[PDB]
Amino acid sequence: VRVQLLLSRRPESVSFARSVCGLLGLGTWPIHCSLKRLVLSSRPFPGASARLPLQRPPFCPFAALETDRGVDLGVAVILQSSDKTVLLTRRARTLSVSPNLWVPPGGHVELEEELLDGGLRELWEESGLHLPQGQFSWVPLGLWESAYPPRLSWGLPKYHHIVLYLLVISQESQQQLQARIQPNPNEVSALMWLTPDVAAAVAALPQDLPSVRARPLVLHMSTLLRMIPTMAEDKERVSTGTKFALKLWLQHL
Ligand code: EMC
Ligand code: EMC
């Protein structure tokens, strides 16, 4: 699944090297979009279902520079409990493409699947939370242009995504939710729940509560506030897009 821009009134694919953010404008708002092709435009259009914030990290490789590939599309899910807490997942210790990142569960949008289905699935592929009909609302939060490797300091970029974060707001408690959680060891090595105050801190109490059966873990604010390096390194920290997402979640509240 790819990404197109309505700069005129007739859409076009984006060339990979180009900053989507730049073509539409560190951030731009509101951005009108439809996922059905993700379509983006600074201007409204007949198809569009949401007006969203689009941001890039200050270290974006494409904004710096201003081709057998294109601009992929990812989805990631911010799952809020009845208790106003959100789930994060540390990516599996078992390596390859961004290991030990705390990120919300997410990944490639499939091909022909709707957005909520990509989220709700990716949630399930990682946490094994299946959400029962009528026991959750959802709202799209925003759009985040990213790369692997993250920035010029780590290499020229291979991957180029637009990530759409969803907020899935459950009517169930964290107790009730954590109960029926059954993660996949191969995809995630740790799960945690964030309060607003901890999220507020991460986005902008010295320790928060398993690693993976289920060994308990004390994650230290130090870790959760760790910033991104210049020189590559796979150290346990919270990704820059997740920070954008969590900021957005707080705006929502
Ligand atoms: C020039 C605003 Hg991404
Ligand atoms: C499907 C919300 Hg751009």
UniProtKB/Swiss-Prot annotation:
One Pfam match, given by its short name, reads NUDIX
Q: Annotated Gene Ontology MF terms?
A: metal ion binding; NADH pyrophosphatase activity
Which keywords does UniProt give here? Hydrolase, Magnesium, Manganese, Metal-binding
EC category name? hydrolase
Enzyme nomenclature, EC number: 3.6.1.62
| UniProt xrefs under SUPFAM superfamilies | Nudix
Q: What does the protein in this record do? A: Acts as a decapping enzyme capable of hydrolyzing monomethylated capped RNAs (in vitro). Hydrolyzes monomethylated capped RNA after alpha and beta phosphates to form N(7)-methyl-GDP. Shows low activity towards unmethylated capped RNA.
Its family remark reads: Belongs to the Nudix hydrolase family.
Q: What is this protein called?
A: m7GpppN-mRNA hydrolase NUDT17
Organism, per UniProt? Homo sapiens
